[PDB]
Design a protein around this ligand. Sequence first.
Ligand SMILES: Nc1ncnc2c1ncn2[C@@H]1O[C@H](COP(=O)(O)OP(=O)(O)O)[C@@H](O)[C@H]1O
Ligand SMILES: Nc1ncnc2c1ncn2[C@@H]1O[C@H](COP(=O)(O)OP(=O)(O)O)[C@@H](O)[C@H]1O
Length: 203
Amino acid sequence: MILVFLGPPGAGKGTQAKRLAKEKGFVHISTGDILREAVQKGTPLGKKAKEYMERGELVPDDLIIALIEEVFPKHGNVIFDGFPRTVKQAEALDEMLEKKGLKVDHVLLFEVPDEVVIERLSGRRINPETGEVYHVKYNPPPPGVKVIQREDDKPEVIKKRLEVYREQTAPLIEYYKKKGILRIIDASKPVEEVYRQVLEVIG
Ligand SMILES: Nc1ncnc2c1ncn2[C@@H]1O[C@H](COP(=O)(O)OP(=O)(O)O)[C@@H](O)[C@H]1O
Ligand SMILES: Nc1ncnc2c1ncn2[C@@H]1O[C@H](COP(=O)(O)OP(=O)(O)O)[C@@H](O)[C@H]1O
């Protein structure tokens, strides 16, 4: 089974993907996580990607498409989390999978309104030792635990990211809907409720 998690930044896609991977044994492919590691390690990919990410822009398609070929597993069910983000990326994924006799089985669209997006992202915090994601209101870090705020979770970058999402990524809704594989998730609900809907949708 191959899943794609699609939707505005802050919808809770990462959070749900991590849970589903941990509990059901999917391979979680987070382009954001992988890129952040690349930036940290100072790889050719990292150095090139860094500025796009800090500015809230998408990293160029060719780099991401290569990244996906590099990390796609020989076996296992997969969650694509934050990929694809453009039509060109979605077409390259279809091609890549077709060559492997595979296809996207479900595209879960995590719907949230802008107000919730801003609230979720502005409050997002990361434990730098473990990568665990918290929220200052909805899931605060344990007392005493040091966390950081991502530079792209600052207000003006969130604004850019949402524009970029609406411009480049939202067309994917129609792209996948035509194929009859688009599943709507009400991502504005609490985490446990969203996860139950994720499980129902994928059977
Ligand atoms: N599939 C992709 N294509 C291009 N850029 C990406 C992709 N995935 C992640 N990025 C880059 O990394 C940034 C953070 O992505 P991600 O962690 O997936 O976003 P979010 O903040 O919604 O969790 C994006 O704004 C973009 O610069
Ligand atoms: N269902 C939810 N209700 C409340 N807060 C949430 C929910 N899902 C995620 N969060 C919090 O909102 C922020 C965005 O979640 P994340 O999974 O990073 O989103 P995405 O991967 O879609 O950008 C994080 O701070 C996370 O702890």
